[PDB]
């Protein structure tokens, strides 16, 4: 078992090994791969041969025997990235949009930040363009709170108080349905009335202490962070948040014993939850492999949640384009007016794009444009087909 | 490659014939055609050599089978469960029978049957699966597929729209730019029928339709009902509210007689198939514009790929939504209780049942769709790696 | 009686004299009221002069009436300078050459007593078209009634948009001002008949509404509705799958008949006895025939003025405060209830579809005048009083 | 004159034959003439009715002579209340019973009033009239209407706050009477702007009786999330006029729901509606014409919520409902009205006042676009 990875590769070098570990796209930074590379490390003390190999080696062998012998989700990993770059510079050249100015905080950002992360469902890692910058996931946290919602109380709990369907362009400034009852998730009035589900009992700090940690083990536990800035100026200035939660007040859409204005106050706080690129490309992988965090192997996330969430994300995910977006990409996102892109390509791989600067519908016009040349170039929309993708290519093999 | 088959099983003819049928396939199978000819010739035992002489043409297709190398190994341990779901839909007699018109109105309450066909040409079938029923508005994706393959995505859409227009609105005819919301719906489908064939005339229209139909079912049962096309013709006042708002506001193309579409769009809906010969046709769509049975080349990816889109989308009327929340799985209502169910890469299904309900669907076959949901990891958004207790039928 | 209306008008009075004096008053000679009187008069000038004995062998016939007018009893007293006044409006219109036609202008006045004033191109015949729809409601009405016309149609504006809605929540057209609801108020009238028939029993009721004044037919823009229909029979199709006809109905036919009754012609000043008879309760203020019944009169003027000048209603009640009809081919229908009636015709429209040259004409007489739905009758600040 | 009036005296017999005119004793025009029988007093020749009713002889022929807008008050007083008594026998409803009273006041200061016209209910809804018709008169047409619209609306289109031009919908929805409280005396604090309204109401109403509720303004206050919720819309969306703090606007719009007034008060109040901006007991000059035009005109399309449309065919006439159960009916160049009862219908409108607006109309020919002339058998109080 380990003797077999061994001759795949006299004896051998360290950086040998090191390197066409990378070209599978792992990182040597991997929790799964920590034994293997402190042994590897601390031998160093005391190149390397047969016996010696299987010693540092056998600790996590079958990570390591199955990325040799090509048994990832991409195996050629490197020519995907070659192609990912690719778009990124075709979708680089596009300096259009308005970076939302609304509060301060977005608008300090500029409109040359281009970054997308890509994280896949056995581990792989690549990254292009301004990744290790954190901005605020704002509405891009709808769909991992709706997922937690959806963990702990279960999927027909939830939807005794929130909708399941995309109400269109009208009706869609109309806070409720006629059940008097938010849209879907995904809209601000069913976000917060989400947002109210989760630990009904505790105080805010608490609720935001056991959200902080459950979004650390969907990232493997990479940067999330926590912009007061945001929060103070979203505070200030959501008069028609208030508007809403006034409306659910009064239209009895919140459980029994809840606080209002102690919701409201917790929506905010969310929205103004920090990610990086990369930290968040993880986050979409952990939706794209049914739960469990690829970079740590935990299982953070039920079944019955996370299908849920693609499920919403592709109907009412990227707002008003969500029809033509569901139509030429086929692919689950959410949109936040940091502009940011939480897109998953579910059993393949997480990514998270980035670019300040939003359109007429508030979303990044290069991860827009990026989105769409994805899918122009590779068969991973919805109704593609495995067999017959006509011109298309499959990295998967 | 035919020796090992031979080696793998004298051989008495049957104990192949029934190692075949053990695969899930049908004798009958056009892909045989060789192998059953050259078969029903020699005629009980066979050697090496004319076990070799019989399958040598479809050596691949028959390696392919005995194999285990289908979208479904086991295929008995799938109908048995495919049975069990039917059984327990068999048992609500709830719903009313379409009495609009007496063709719809004729069918018993009773009648109920569902078909099955992978994307290898498996085959089941259980209940009345070969009693002729119109497709009605199980056509609409159909049209849109032809009309997307020999258009193109970009002029068809110049027409209609891409959108689930939502609840009410839809109750339009028209969205706020003149276009009706998508395909899926009567204002939808008539737009898009006056776009196929532009040059010709009806009878001509209507021959070209069939031929495309007849490519996606493999040569199964298609046929025509005069019956129905007369009374929905006749009593279709909504259908003609429609073409002359349609007319009003230009959605037609140039030079297009709305009469004359209208006939064209009655005839379209009251095409008779049974629930074999529509599995066929909804597995096409689940094997990118391939007739699983034939093998030949049908409609191209792209028209299959925004097809089944669309009835993820905007299938299933008012349930439509619903739909996509808990079964996930491209769908089509009519009203004579068709649903025309499809899932990609794996196979294709039509469930029929006469009696419908408030929304306007078959309720035993909405009822078989949301239990084989249940049971089996076929969900559109199920994950292929953990998909906690249910069933891989793909393996 | 006639002896003091004698001198009222030395010892003889010239035949001419009595005449330009009743001109004053705004009646005409041609007037229904007064035929045995000019037609005694012209006998006598048989045998230019008239003393106390021929002049009562003349005026005996129509005294009432005649004193009415010299007693200055009539609603607009003094008339001269009123009609002096709607001549200032006219000339403001007329600078205003905006619109698009779908040049000329004239506004003709009948006041409820008979009373008349034109001016501008009066007697050039135009299309009615939606001017109608009023019309068609009373003659329901007046035959029917309002629980069973009210049956079919309802009594409510709609709103900016489910204005592009055929039906209300009931099933029902919206009010008998828009097409799908005058389309069934036209299936309401002369149901066992033809459209032969049914034609001809309408343009009875509108003779006798316009005191036997010009009402006629077009046949050249009743051919262009009938292949311009698309929209109407879009409409007629969704009005049968709700079945919202009565039985036996042929909307196929109701729609022809439909196009028929937009086709028919008058003037400025047949339409205007053809309103004033509606702000006259019902009666001809020329013939003093009933025409209509006060429940049809009603009726009518509510719809028209909630209903009446297309989405521009709300806009419409709020600075003009009157009921009234628009038409495409650019005549208005206006009337001020127990005061008068009128017609504005000008071709061109507005963006909202209505004659521009008429709106400018109604805003500028209720600017003027306390004519005004909920204007004050004790203190109207600076607005004018023609009632005296 | 007065010596016309003399022939045309024991004191009983003069007051007692003024009485039958529908005038009052208490009537503000008809004061000094009363003082002066309070003078003689501790039977009038020529020389001392002519000294009483010296001041006064204009209103008192007027009133002799019948010269009032409604000649034969008794017999249209008798009228009224066999209306009122025959509306009394519905008692379907529910209240938001047992109490029912209607109040007149016509435009030439005539009384009369009859049932529970002496207790005091909150103006609520009702109020919204007067709130606006205050604005238009202290600002102008054109300056309220770029902040509310004047339209009517539409059953599922008044689930909406604001139309397309991002303005409310009328001056008699709930987010169009919160826009219209922050148009007036915007200068002053929450205090002085109460103060002021409460000075207005006072003039319309003759110096009768106005009031506040405050158990129902807290009571307001509490409830309020729906008010809360339009407030809040109406502010991201840049509607009040510029320095507004708008949690304290709601404040004062729940103060001027929670005012009292009675039937007899606020019969005056329509009446000086009703009279062109004069009120008619005292012939005071309180509001303009253009405020009393366009007031009239939204209380005919808007005033009764959604009943409007069936309420301005079959009645014609500009009302206002409220919660309490109060109409505030107003018949232009005759009356002014205010009819109370606590039980509304599935509309919101009292059922009692509902069934008498209705029947009053059917009786007399105050409709709208009734004719002068000819009205069938419908009623003309006028002749
Ligand atoms: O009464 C009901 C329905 C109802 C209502 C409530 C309850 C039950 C039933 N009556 C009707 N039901 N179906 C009807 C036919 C469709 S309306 C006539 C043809 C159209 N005119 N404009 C259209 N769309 C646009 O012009 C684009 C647009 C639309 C909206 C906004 C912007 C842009 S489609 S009428
Ligand atoms: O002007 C515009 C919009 C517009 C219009 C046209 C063009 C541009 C913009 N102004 C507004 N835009 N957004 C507004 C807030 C939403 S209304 C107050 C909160 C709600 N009240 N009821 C709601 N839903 C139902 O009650 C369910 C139901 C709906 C319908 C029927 C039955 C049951 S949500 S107002």
Redesign the interface.
Same mark, same amino acid.
């Given at each position: 078992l380990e003797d077999l990875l061994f001759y795949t590769i006299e004896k051998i070098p360290v950086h040998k090994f090191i390197t066409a570990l990378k070209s599978t796209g792992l990182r040597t930074s991997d929790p799964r791969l920590k034994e293997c590379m402190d042994m590897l490390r601390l031998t160093l003390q005391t190149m390397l041969d047969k016996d010696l190999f299987k010693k540092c080696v056998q600790s996590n062998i079958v990570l390591l025997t199955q990325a040799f012998r090509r048994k990832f989700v991409i195996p050629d990993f490197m020519s995907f990235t070659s192609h990912i770059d690719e778009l990124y510079e075709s979708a680089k050249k596009q300096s259009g949009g308005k970076v939302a100015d609304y509060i301060p905080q977005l608008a300090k950002f500029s409109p040359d930040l281009w970054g997308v992360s890509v994280c896949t469902?056995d581990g792989q890692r690549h990254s292009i363009g301004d990744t290790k910058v954190p901005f605020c996931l704002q509405s891009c946290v709808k769909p991992l709170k709706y997922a937690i919602a959806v963990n702990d109380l279960g999927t027909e709990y939830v939807h005794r108080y929130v909708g399941?369907?995309?109400? %269109?362009?009208?009706?869609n400034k109309?806070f409720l #349905?006629?059940d008097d009852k938010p849209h879907n998730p995904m809209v601000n009035a069913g976000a917060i009335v989400v947002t109210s589900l989760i630990k009904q009992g505790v105080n805010n700090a608490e609720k935001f202490d056991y959200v902080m940690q459950f979004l650390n083990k969907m990232a493997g536990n990479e940067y999330v962070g926590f912009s007061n800035a945001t929060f103070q100026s979203e505070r200030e200035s959501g $008069?028609?948040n208030?508007?809403?939660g006034?409306?659910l007040?009064?239209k009895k859409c919140f459980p029994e014993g809840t606080d209002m204005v102690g919701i409201l106050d917790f929506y905010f706080q969310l929205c103004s939850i920090e990610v990086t690129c990369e930290s968040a490309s993880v986050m979409a992988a952990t939706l794209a492999? %049914? %739960?469990?965090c690829p970079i740590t192997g935990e299982r953070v996330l039920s079944?019955?949640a996370?299908?849920?969430t693609?499920?919403?994300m592709?109907?009412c995910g990227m707002y008003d384009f969500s %029809?033509?977006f569901?139509?030429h990409v086929?692919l689950?996102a959410k949109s936040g007016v940091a502009g940011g892109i939480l897109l998953v390509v579910?059993?393949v791989m997480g990514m998270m794009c980035w670019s300040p600067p939003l359109d007429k519908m508030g979303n990044s016009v290069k991860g827009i444009h990026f989105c769409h040349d994805l899918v122009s170039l590779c068969n991973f929309? #919805?109704? $593609?087909?495995?067999?017959?993708?006509?011109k298309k290519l499959d990295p998967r093999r």
């Open positions: 469902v399941k369907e995309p109400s %269109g362009l009208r009706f109309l #349905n006629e $008069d028609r208030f508007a809403i006034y409306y007040k009064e492999n %049914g %739960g469990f079944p019955e996370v299908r849920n693609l499920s919403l592709h109907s %029809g033509q569901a139509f086929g689950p579910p059993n929309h #919805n109704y $593609d087909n495995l067999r017959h993708f006509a």
